[PDB]
Amino acid sequence: RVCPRILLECKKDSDCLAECVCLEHGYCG
Amino acid sequence: RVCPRILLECKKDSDCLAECVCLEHGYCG
Amino acid sequence: RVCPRILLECKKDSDCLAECVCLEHGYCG
Amino acid sequence: RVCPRILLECKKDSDCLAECVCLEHGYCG
Ligand SMILES: [Zn+2]
């Protein structure tokens, strides 16, 4: 899985880069 | 992101297939 | 990268499953 | 598939970034 480790807040996966997922702490990972 | 539509429980991401991740509700997605 | 190893002929990546790519021998990989 | 738009030569897939693969023409893609 490709998820650059850029710190980004999110509500949905579409708020995230690449194949990062929106995790339960409100950040992409 | 490639995450099969297979119902799987998980404690860690490693429990999941492909690029699915372990969500805190206790299932892969 | 997620590429199921199902034998499939191709001309383009869109002929392939998942994140398989169309390789120079004419099969997905 | 996540393959950065970065010009890279390669002898093997391992030479490439992310989910890029080594094409026989000698570049990642
Ligand atoms: Zn991927």
Swiss-Prot record, chains A, B, C, D:
Keywords: Disulfide bond, Knottin, Protease inhibitor, Secreted, Serine protease inhibitor
SUPFAM superfamilies listed in its UniProt record: Plant inhibitors of proteinases and amylases
InterPro entries from the UniProt entry: Prot_inh_squash, Proteinase_amylase_inhib_sf
SMART domains reported for this sequence: PTI
Pfam family, one: Squash
GO cellular component terms listed in the entry, alphabetical order: extracellular region
Superkingdom field: Eukaryota
UniProt-annotated location(s): Secreted
Coiled-coil boundaries: none
CDD domains the UniProt entry points to: PlantTI
One Gene Ontology MF term: serine-type endopeptidase inhibitor activity
Marked site positions, Reactive bond: 5-6
Disulfide-bonded cysteines: 3-20, 10-22, 16-28
Family membership noted in the UniProt record: Belongs to the protease inhibitor I7 (squash-type serine protease inhibitor) family.
Primary role: Inhibits trypsin.
Entry's free-text remark on domains: The presence of a 'disulfide through disulfide knot' structurally defines this protein as a knottin.
Protein name: Trypsin inhibitor 1
